[PDB]
Amino acid sequence: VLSEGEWQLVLHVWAKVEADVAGHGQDILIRLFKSHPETLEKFDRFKHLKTEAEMKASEDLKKHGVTVLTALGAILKKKGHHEAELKPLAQSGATKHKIPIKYLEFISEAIIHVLHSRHPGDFGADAQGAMNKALELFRKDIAAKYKELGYQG
Numbered sequence: 001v002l003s004e005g006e007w008q009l010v011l012h013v014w015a016k017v018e019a020d021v022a023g024h025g026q027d028i029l030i031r032l033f034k035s036h037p038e039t040l041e042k043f044d045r046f047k048h049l050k051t052e053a054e055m056k057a058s059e060d061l062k063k064h065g066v067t068v069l070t071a072l073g074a075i076l077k078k079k080g081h082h083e084a085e086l087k088p089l090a091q092s093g094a095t096k097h098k099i100p101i102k103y104l105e106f107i108s109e110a111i112i113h114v115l116h117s118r119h120p121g122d123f124g125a126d127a128q129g130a131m132n133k134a135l136e137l138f139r140k141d142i143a144a145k146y147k148e149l150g151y152q153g
C-alpha cells in the first residue's frame with residue numbers, strides 16, 4: 001500500500017506522461033525490446049522491425065504503446081483500488097499472451113528509465129520510490145490474479 005503523498009507523486013509525473021502518450025509509449029517499448037530482446041518475441045507484427053528508427057515509424061507499434069499506457073494510467077489513477085481494471089489484463093496475460101511477471105519487471109524498468117530521461121525535474125528520488133511502489137503493487141496483484149486463473153508466470 002502507498003501513502004496519499006506517494007500516490008500524488010505518481011499521478012504528478014503521470015500527468016506529464018499524458019502530454020505525449022504516443023512518444024512515451026514508443027520510447028518505453030523500444031527501451032524494453034533493446035534491453036531484453038526476448039520480450040520482442042511476444043509481438044508477431046513487431047519482430048520485422050530491425051532498427052530503432054523502424055520502430056518509431058511503425059504506426060502499429062505507436063498505437064500499441066498508447067493502448068498499454070492508457071491501461072496503466074487508468075490503473076494508477078485508482079490508487080490501489082484497481083481490481084476491476086486489472087482483471088482483464090490478468091486474463092489476457094495469463095490465458096492468451098503468457099506474459100511472465102519477470103517480463104512485467106522488464107517493462108517496469110523501461111517505464112522508470114524513460115520517465116527519468118524525460119522528466120528528471122519531476123522524477124527525483126521520492127517520486128522514483130513512489131512509482132516503484134505503484135508498479136510493485138501492480139505486479140503483485142496481477143501475479144495473484146494470474147494464479148487464480150492457473151498461470152504460474
Ligand code: HEM
Nearest residue numbers: 039042043067068069071072088089092097099103104107
Ligand atoms: C505495464 C504493463 C502492461 C500493460 C498495461 C499492458 C496492456 C495491454 C493491453 C491493454 C493490451 C490490449 C489488450 C489485451 O490483449 O489485453 C495489450 C496487449 C498485448 N500485450 Fe500487454 N501490457 C503490459 C505489458 C506487456 C509486456 C511486458 C508484454 C511482453 C513482453 C506484453 C505483451 C502483449 C502482447 C503480445 C499483446 C497483444 C498485442 C497484439 O498483437 O495486438 N504486454 N497489453
